[PDB]
Write a protein that binds this ligand. Sequence first.
Ligand SMILES: O=CCCCC[C@@H]1SC[C@@H]2NC(=O)N[C@@H]21
Ligand SMILES: O=CCCCC[C@@H]1SC[C@@H]2NC(=O)N[C@@H]21
Lengths: 90, 541, 541
Amino acid sequence: LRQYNIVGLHTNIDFLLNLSGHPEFEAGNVHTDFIPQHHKQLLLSRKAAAKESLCQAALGLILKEKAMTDTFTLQAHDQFSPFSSSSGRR
Amino acid sequence: YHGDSVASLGTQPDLGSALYQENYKQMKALVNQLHERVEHIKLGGGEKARALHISRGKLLPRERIDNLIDPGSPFLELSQFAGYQLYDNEEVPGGGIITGIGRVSGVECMIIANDATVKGGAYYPVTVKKQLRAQEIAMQNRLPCIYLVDSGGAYLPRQADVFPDRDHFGRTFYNQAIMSSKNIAQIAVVMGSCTAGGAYVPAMADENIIVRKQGTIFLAGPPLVKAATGEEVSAEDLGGADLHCRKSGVSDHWALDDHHALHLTRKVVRNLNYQKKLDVTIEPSEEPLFPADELYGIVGANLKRSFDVREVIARIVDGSRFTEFKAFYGDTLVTGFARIFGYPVGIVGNNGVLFSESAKKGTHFVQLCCQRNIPLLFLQNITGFMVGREYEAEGIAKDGAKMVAAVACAQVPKITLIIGGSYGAGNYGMCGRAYSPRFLYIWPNARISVMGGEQAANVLATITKDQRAREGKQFSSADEAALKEPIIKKFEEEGNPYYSSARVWDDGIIDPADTRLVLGLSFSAALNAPIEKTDFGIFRM
Amino acid sequence: YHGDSVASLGTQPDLGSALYQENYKQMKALVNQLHERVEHIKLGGGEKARALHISRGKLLPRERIDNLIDPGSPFLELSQFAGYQLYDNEEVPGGGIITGIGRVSGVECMIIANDATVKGGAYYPVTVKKQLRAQEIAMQNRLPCIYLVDSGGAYLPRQADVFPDRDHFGRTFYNQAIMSSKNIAQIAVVMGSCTAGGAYVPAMADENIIVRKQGTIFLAGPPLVKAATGEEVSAEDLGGADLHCRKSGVSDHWALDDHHALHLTRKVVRNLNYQKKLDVTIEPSEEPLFPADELYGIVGANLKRSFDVREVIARIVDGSRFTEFKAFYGDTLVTGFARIFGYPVGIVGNNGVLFSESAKKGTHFVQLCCQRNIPLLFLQNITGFMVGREYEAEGIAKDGAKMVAAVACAQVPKITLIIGGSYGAGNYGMCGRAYSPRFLYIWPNARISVMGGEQAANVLATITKDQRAREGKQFSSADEAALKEPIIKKFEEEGNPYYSSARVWDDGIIDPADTRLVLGLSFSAALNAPIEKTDFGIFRM
Ligand SMILES: O=CCCCC[C@@H]1SC[C@@H]2NC(=O)N[C@@H]21
Ligand SMILES: O=CCCCC[C@@H]1SC[C@@H]2NC(=O)N[C@@H]21
C-alpha cells in the first residue's frame, strides 16, 4: 500500500494504512462497527514535518534546477562551459 | 581521428622535501589572508548601514546579483579589492561598486551594481575607474551590460578626480552610447535614488526598469530645486517610478519591489534575440592530471627561488597535455599549444631572464597563434632582460622590441596572469596592462614595479657612492643603508599585490588553486566576440 | 536557463453575457458568408467550362496545385477574391489566376497558375495586378516561382489597362529577369496554349517544362500568321512540345501529360541546391491558452464598440505569453514581445485614438525591433488621431510623422492585420499597403477609407450648412440628409472588405479563427530571406 502512489486527486490509501495498522485488526477481532468504534483512531491529523524531511525537499528543488540547467546546455553550442555547472561557487 | 596517444607534462613533487613543506606553508598563509580580507569586504558599509538598507525594503547589493543570475551559476567578480586602503581615513569596501560576469537567461552579461551601503553609494575616483574598466571588458567581448543603479552622486571633496577628464565620470555615458550603437544591449535597473549624472544612466539605456517607490530619477535634486526656485518637493514627486513610467516616459518597465525588478530584467535579456557562436574548434574537456593545490608547494612565496613554469602549466591544462614549440631554443621562454575546458590556447610563460633568442622565439610563436586565430595566455614571472655589452651589440633591444610590437598588434583574445615578478620592459613584452589583455590576474605572491626593489637600491648605491667618491667627501657603509633601506621599503610597499589591486591595475587577486576555473570562465566570456584578422606593423629584422 | 515562470495574457470572456452572444452571432454570420462565397469561387468558370477542360485530358487548375505540392502540406492561397464584382457584367472568379505559397520537395515556393476555365485564361487588368503582387512577394522573400502556364492572352477590350504602363503586363517579364539575376529560380510549366506575350514566360524561365500535345508556344498565333503571310498552320505545328523540345530548343523537359509534368517539376525543384537558414532564435512552439473561436464574441461586427486588443493577442501567441513595453505610457497603443510558432515577434496594436505619447512609444519600439532583427506584426484597429488645438501646438503631426518614418525604413519583415477600422493617416503609421508589409490581411468586419463614413458626412454637413447660412438661403434638416445619406452609402460600399479585396489592396480575407495559422505560415515564408540592417532617416526630434 505504501508503494501505491496517486497525485492529482483525494484517495482512501491513507485510511487503509491506518486500518491495517490498528492492533485489533492484527488480532483478527473484526466486527462491522470497526470503523465507527475506532473512528477517532482511524482518521488522524497531519503532524509537523521533521527538519530532516525539509532538508530533503530543499535538495529536491536544487537538483531539479540542476536538471533544467542541463537541458539548456544540450541545446547550446558551448556545451562544456564552466558557467553551465550548478556549483554555486564564488 | 583523435585516438593518438601523447605525452603529458608534470611530475610528482616531493611532498616530504623541506622546500615543499616551507613553500606550501607560506603560500597557504597568503591565501588565508586573502580569503579573510574578502570576507570583510563582503560586508560592505557595515551592520548599521546594512540594517538601514534592509529597513527600507531594499535587497542587499550582493543578494540582488544572486537573484539576477541563473540558479547555481558561477559569478566571476572583478576588482574585489578596489579602494583597499586607497584613501587615508575612509574605508571604501570594493570601491562602492560590485562588478562581475554572470549568466542571465543563459547569456553572459556584465553586471554593474552600486553598493548603497558604502558611503551612500557616492562615486569615489576609484569607483569611476572600476566601472569604466567593467564597461571596457563588456565592449571588447560584446557582453550586455546590466546596471543595478543605486547611487548618491559624485563625492564632492574629490570632484577634480571624478568629473573633468576623459577617463572621468563623463566617459561612463560615452561608453553606453557607443555600445548601444554596436547592438550591445544596455539595461538599467533603477533600484534606488539616482541624481544629477546618475539620472542619465536610465535615460541612456536601451531598456529601463524602475522600482515603485525606492527608485528616483531627476537631473536636479530637491535641494537644488529649492535653492534655484524656492520650491519644496519630495524626491518621489520630482522623480519616482509613477512619474517616469506614466508621465515622463523615462521608464520602460514598472516594478513593485526589488524581486519583481530582477524578474523583469531576466525577461528583458531573454528577448535580446542573441545566440552565442564559437569561432574556434572545440574538444571534450578533461581535468589536469595533477592536483591544483600542489601549486602551493611548487611556487611558494619567495621570488628569489626559481621553479619550472611547466609545472604550473601541467596543473591547469586539459589532461596536462602540452605541445612545446622550439623547446631547446631560447629555453628561458616556454611556448606551446594546449586546451583549457576544450578551448585551444597558446601559452607563453617566463622560465628565466629574457634573451635575444627568447624574444625571437616569442615573436615567431605569436604570429602562429594570430594566423590560426588561437587565444593567447601569458604567464608573467620575470626577472629582467639579459644585461651585457655583447647582448646590446647584438640588438637585444631590437629583439625585445620585436615581441612588444607583435604582442600589441595581436587581435586574438589575450589573458595575462602574473605568477611572480613583473619588472621593467619585461612587463610590456609579456602583455602588461598597457597592452589591453582581455583580463589580467595576479597571484597573492606577485610583485610589480618599474624595477626590482634591490636593483633600485643598488643603482642608487652606485650613484651616491660615486657622488661622494668623485666629489671627495667619503660616504661610508652606514651612509649606504640610510640610502638603501627607504628605497627597498617603498618598492616593497608599492609592488604589493594589494597595492596594485587597490587601484585598478589588475582584475583581481586569485587563489592559485582557482587558476584553472578563472581562466575557463574568462576565456569563455572572451569568445562572445568574433575573432578579427591581425594586422602587423613593420618587423624590424 | 529558460525555466522561469512568467505571467500570461488573456481572460475568460463571459459567455452568458448578452454582448458576447450578440457579437458571436454577428461575426459567425460574416464567416459563414465568407466561406460560401469562396466555395463558389472554387468552381472557377463553371460546369460547362470545367467539363470542356477535362475533356481535353487536362487537369483542373486546383488539382494541379494539389498534385504539385508535398502530400498533405498546407497551401496558403492569396487574393482569393480578386475580381469579385469588379467588372459590371463579367464574372471573373479569382481574377482568372490562382496564386499561393506551398511546399514543393520541402522548399517553400510561389505557385502562379492560370485558370483556363475562366474566360479561357485571358488576362484581365486585375489578373495582371494579382500576378504582379505574387511576384513581388516571391522576390521580397526569395521564394522560387513556378508558373503553371495556361493562358489565352490579353483581354483586348481593356487593353489600355493591361499593356502600356509600368505595372502592366510588361512588368511580368521584367520581374522574371530580375529574380533570375538574383538566383531566385524561375520555373515555367506549359500545360496549355500560350500566345504573344505568353510565349515569353517559358522563354524567360531558368528551366522549362512543356506537355506533349496540350502545350503550345507561339509569339504569333496561327490567326496572325494567316493574316500576315496567308498560311494555314495548326497550333501544334507552329508550337507544340515536339517542335520546341527537339527543334526550337525552347523546351528543357518534355512531359507526356499533366501528371508527368507535375512530377518533373518536383524533380527540378529538388535540384536547386537550396537549404533554408534561419537568422532568428527559435524556441519550442506552444498553443495559446484560450480558444481562438472566442474571438467571435470578443470582437463582433460593430466597429463603434471597443475591445481590448490584448484579448486578441492572448489567443494567437505561443502560450499566451506577452512582455508589454511601456505599458502605462501612451496606453492607446500596445507594444510588446511574443512568439508565434517559435518565431520572435514584436506586436504593435491599436487600443484607441493615437496620441503624441502613443506615436513616440511606437517609434521607440520599432527601433528596438530593428536593432535586434525581430519581425514586426501590426494589428490595425484605428479610429483616427487626437483632434485638438493643444495637441497640434505640441506637434502631434510631428509625433505622428516620427512613426510613419520609422515604420517605412524598418527592414525587418513586417506583417499587417486589419482587425477593425483603417482611416486616414492612422493607416500609414500602422504599416498600410503603401509601406510594403510582406503580407497584409483583413478580417471580414474591417473597414478602410480615407476617413470614416460619418466624418465625411458630418464634415460636408458643416460645409453646406455654412454654404447656405453664410450665403443666406436657409438649408433645412431634411436638406441635410439629402447631403449625408449618399455619402454614407458610398463610404460603406467602398470600405467593405470585399471591395478592398476584389481589387488587390490586401492579400486575402481570413477567418479570425485562422489568424494564428495564417500568421505562422506567413512569417515562416518571410524568413527565407536574410534580414538586412536597418538604415533610418533623420528623426525630427
Ligand atoms: O547658484 C546658487 C544656487 C541657485 C542658483 C543656481 C542656478 S538654478 C539654475 C541653474 N541650474 C543649476 O543647477 N544651477 C543654476
Ligand atoms: O497589318 C495587318 C496584318 C498583317 C500585316 C501585319 C504585319 S505581319 C509582320 C508584322 N508582325 C506583326 O505582328 N504584324 C506586322
